[PDB]
Amino acid sequence: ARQAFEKAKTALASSVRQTHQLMINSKQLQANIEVQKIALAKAQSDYNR
Amino acid sequence: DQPAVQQAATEVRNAWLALERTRIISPMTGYVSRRAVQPGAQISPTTPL
Amino acid sequence: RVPLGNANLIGREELQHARDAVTSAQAQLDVAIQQYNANQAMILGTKLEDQPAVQQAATEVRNAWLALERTRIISPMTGYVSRRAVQPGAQISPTTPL
Structure with missing residues (x-):
C-alpha cells in the first residue's frame, strides 16, 4: 500500500508541473501578439505618410 | 482547481484510503468469541477473522 | 542614429x-x-534521482523485487510441524494450505 501511495503522489506532482507549463505557454503567445502588433503599427504609420 | 490536479488528487485519496485500511477496526462494543486469525496468516476481504 | 535627428539631418521615417x-x-x-x-x-527538482518520472519506475522495481524475494516461504512462528500436504512439483496459489 505504501508503494502504491508513493506512485500516486508522483503522478500528482507530474500533473501539477504540466499545468504550470501550459500557463507559461500563455505568456509566450502574448509576446507573439505583441510583436505582430508592432509590425501592424509600423505598416500603418508608413501608409499615412 | 485545474482538472488534471483534481484527477491526480482523487487517485492519491484512493491510495491513502487503501493504506489506512490496513488496521481493521471493530464496529461494536462487545466481546471476542470465535477467533480464527493467527499472525502470519494470508487473509482476503472474505475471510472471517 | 539618434543624435543626427536632433540636428535635423536624416529623415524621420x-x-x-x-x-x-x-x-x-x-x-x-x-x-x-x-x-x-x-x-x-x-x-524544477535539482537532482536527477529525485525527478517524478524516475521515482515511478523505482516503485515498480521495488514491487517486482518484493515479488521475487517472496518465492522463499518463511515460518512466522517457532513451533513444530504437524501436517504436510506439500510435495515437490505441486502448483501452489495463496489459497492452498501447506
Whole structure:
C-alpha cells in the first residue's frame, strides 16, 4: 500500500508541473501578439505618410 | 482547481484510503468469541477473522 | 542614429524604423525567455534521482523485487510441524494450505 501511495503522489506532482507549463505557454503567445502588433503599427504609420 | 490536479488528487485519496485500511477496526462494543486469525496468516476481504 | 535627428539631418521615417526594430527585438527576446521558462517547470527538482518520472519506475522495481524475494516461504512462528500436504512439483496459489 505504501508503494502504491508513493506512485500516486508522483503522478500528482507530474500533473501539477504540466499545468504550470501550459500557463507559461500563455505568456509566450502574448509576446507573439505583441510583436505582430508592432509590425501592424509600423505598416500603418508608413501608409499615412 | 485545474482538472488534471483534481484527477491526480482523487487517485492519491484512493491510495491513502487503501493504506489506512490496513488496521481493521471493530464496529461494536462487545466481546471476542470465535477467533480464527493467527499472525502470519494470508487473509482476503472474505475471510472471517 | 539618434543624435543626427536632433540636428535635423536624416529623415524621420529612418528613426521610426529604428525604434520599431528595437521594440520588435525586445518582443522576440521576451518570446525566447518564455520558451525557456516553460520546460524549466519540468526540471524544477535539482537532482536527477529525485525527478517524478524516475521515482515511478523505482516503485515498480521495488514491487517486482518484493515479488521475487517472496518465492522463499518463511515460518512466522517457532513451533513444530504437524501436517504436510506439500510435495515437490505441486502448483501452489495463496489459497492452498501447506
